[PDB]
């Protein structure tokens, strides 16, 4: 599925994101070489996206949907569930696998 999840610290092991819920996360995104490209932590502002509304790359949502409330985890996303062959100009190169350190802060 191009999304591998490596737990860093557990969540409540009970509350997982459901359709239509707003996921509230902190994330730090890096390329495979470790270079950081985006970080909600650096801006001190949590990122929010609605489950099932396609408001984030497929890999990120798929990984988050497997996390329970309060969990923190490393999501590795292959290009086919991220930005593909084009990438995102000036940020993500072609065929990039991306690593996100994600914390699921809340579900609203």
């Amino acid at each position: 599925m191009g999304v591998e999840i490596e737990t860093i610290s557990p969540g409540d092991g009970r509350t997982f994101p459901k359709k239509g819920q707003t996921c509230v996360v902190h994330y730090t995104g890096m390329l495979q070489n470790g270079k950081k490209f985006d970080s909600s932590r650096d801006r001190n502002k949590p990122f929010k996206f609605r489950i099932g509304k396609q408001e984030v790359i497929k890999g990120f949502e798929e990984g988050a949907a497997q996390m329970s409330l309060g969990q923190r985890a490393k999501l590795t996303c292959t290009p086919d569930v991220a930005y593909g062959a084009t990438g995102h100009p000036g940020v993500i190169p072609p065929n990039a696998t991306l690593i996100f350190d994600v914390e699921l802060l809340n579900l609203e």
Binding site: S40, E55, G90
Partner: protein
């Protein structure tokens, strides 16, 4: 709540990178306000506020790429450079979106067509364009800095009129960047033909010399200056809107058309006699002429034009 809040820490000009997708998918397209070979520009809405969405034709994928890259790698916020919000790819074949501040007055080209200008507005327009172009052209070092940028397709259609009476420069898809991380310039005759400097038309430009590209922009800016000054009233008199070289080339001119006018015949737009009875238009005519020297090295810098326009005002 508002897009301004979301914009109010890191790098690039617009929304945080992952947030660009989120906002782009939350946008509703309302009406097409522009259509061309570039693709389309639409008015759209995000949570009840207007934004502009440029949807690129597949012929222009490379401009989307370059413009997106520039805005995402350079901090390019400035009153007179079109404000970038986000870029997104969306399968709808994949569509390429560039999302920006919406300006309901449209382009300077359209505005000049059925409006004439008082002195205040003429000066505000041309000063604002100069301010934007100087900001593009100048390299700023340090953590709050930017590389120098040359636009390469400056014209009245690629400038938008803002409600406060200033303009902003848009359409950075052909632009080139110059920094200290100086490899070769990443790029010959790419722009709009009617606005091409002699050295573009005869291909004498040294393609690895950034300065040379700035001087090409200055030629085109002189032409924009002329377009605008024609529409300023003096002593009850004004000229109709015309594009540069309207009297000697056809619509959609060829390279050969332009080369013959600009290089071989050394022609320049004519200054109407009525301008010499007005101190502002007299100063603008002088300024124009100093953007149109055949020798690029003699042309004024954007910053010099800005400072001069600041003293006429």
């Amino acid at each position: 709540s508002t897009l301004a809040d979301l914009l109010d820490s890191g790098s690039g000009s617009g929304l945080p990178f992952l947030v660009q997708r989120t906002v782009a998918r939350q946008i509703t397209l309302l009406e097409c306000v522009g259509k061309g070979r570039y693709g389309e520009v639409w008015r759209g809405s995000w949570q009840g506020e207007n934004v502009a969405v440029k949807i690129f034709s597949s012929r222009d994928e490379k401009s989307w790429f370059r413009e997106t890259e520039l805005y995402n790698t350079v901090m390019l916020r400035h009153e007179n450079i079109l404000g970038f919000i986000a870029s997104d790819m969306t399968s709808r074949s994949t569509q390429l979106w560039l999302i920006t501040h919406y300006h309901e007055m449209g382009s300077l080209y359209d505005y000049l067509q059925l409006t004439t200008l008082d002195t205040v507005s003429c000066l505000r327009i041309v000063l604002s364009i100069a301010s934007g172009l100087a900001h593009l052209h100048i390299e700023i070092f340090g953590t709050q800095g930017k590389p120098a940028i040359a636009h390469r397709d400056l014209k009245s259609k690629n400038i938008l009129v803002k409600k406060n009476g200033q303009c902003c420069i848009a359409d950075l898809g052909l632009a080139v960047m110059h920094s200290q991380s100086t490899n070769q310039l990443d790029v010959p005759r790419v722009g709009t033909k009617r606005y091409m400097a002699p050295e573009v038309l005869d291909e004498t430009i040294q393609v690895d010399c950034f300065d040379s590209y700035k001087r090409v922009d200055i030629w085109a800016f002189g032409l924009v200056l002329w377009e605008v000054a024609r529409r300023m009233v003096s002593n009850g008199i004004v000229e109709d809107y015309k594009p540069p070289f309207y009297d000697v080339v056809p619509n959609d001119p060829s390279f050969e058309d332009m080369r013959k006018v600009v290089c071989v015949d050394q022609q320049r737009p004519n200054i109407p006699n009525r301008w010499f009875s007005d101190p502002t238009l007299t100063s603008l005519a002088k300024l124009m002429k100093e953007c149109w020297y055949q020798n690029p090295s003699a042309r004024l810098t954007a910053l010099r034009i800005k400072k001069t326009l600041t003293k006429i005002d």
